[PDB]
Amino acid sequence: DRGLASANVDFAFSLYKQLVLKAPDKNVIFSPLSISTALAFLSLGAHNTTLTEILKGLKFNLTETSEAEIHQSFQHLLRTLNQSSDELQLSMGNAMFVKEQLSLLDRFTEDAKRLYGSEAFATDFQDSAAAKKLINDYVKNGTRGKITDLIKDLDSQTMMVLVNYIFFKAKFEMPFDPQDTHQSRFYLSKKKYVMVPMMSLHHLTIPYFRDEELSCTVVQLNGNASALFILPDQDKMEEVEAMLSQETLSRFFESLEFREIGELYLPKFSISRDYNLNDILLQLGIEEAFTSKADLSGITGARNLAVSQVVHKAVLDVFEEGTERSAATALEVLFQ
Amino acid sequence: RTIVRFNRPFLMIIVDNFTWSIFFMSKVTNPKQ
């Protein structure tokens, strides 16, 4: 539905601003879909206030889209994120790693596989280093070596870990020539600057829009997913971030017209970030899942599970031939 | 005769056309990290 769109953008931009608030000058890279898919996957086993808090935390309105329509949209979306072309490599997976003896409801394992593509891996969490290596290899495999060490510390009393990964590699329509990549200034601010390899192309026709109102330019440099590059004027990053919303995102899309660009300069670079999202998810109202009042009895048939830690890691590579994105989310669950 | 120069902090967003699911989002304040 259209109400799914309103939820997805609100959740993505809400999370983004919360990530920024923790360290307002640091690089940010993350996958909103990865995080919300792991939580939606968890909500398959939630009930009562634990369930409603999760789905509301994801910005869904339950009166507007039912729980079954949310899971349906995730299912449909996951199937589109496994594709291969000469121009695209997409992959996305879900998995649950479970204490070998822990009994799971048939409905939960069936739903998890049908809707989220998730198998169940018997794992010995008491052998903590081996369990960690098992999960980290699954993510490393899924993201083709790009996300390593997603899980650094794992409680040895862990009952299960729900994992999502996503991998996105895309060639530029018009690649940059590496002969035209040269060290150039990058201005952290008006008076702080470093030298970075700066790629360049001449005479590009690409979707373009100058927004003199918000003091920014947006362009598109590339399937069925758009990639927007939003370039605020100097000292206008904060102003631009202040206006991020569904509304202005839609306005950006409705205003992009093809246009010939004399020169385009874009840095060649790699950034990565990892986060613990407990604080942010509690701040978003997902709170009962973390306490002894958690109700995950849709997983096991008892209220014997609560979330302990949610971690997220993402990596972004920009180079002459295209871009590479990957991310993963792990939801760690303890006994109660 | 237009110049677009990513030599200062910028944003990138990957948006699904149909759901407006946001696959990836980033802010680049310093490519040299």
Ligand SMILES: [Cl-]
């Ligand atoms: Cl991005």
Ligand code: NI
């Ligand atoms: Ni703009």
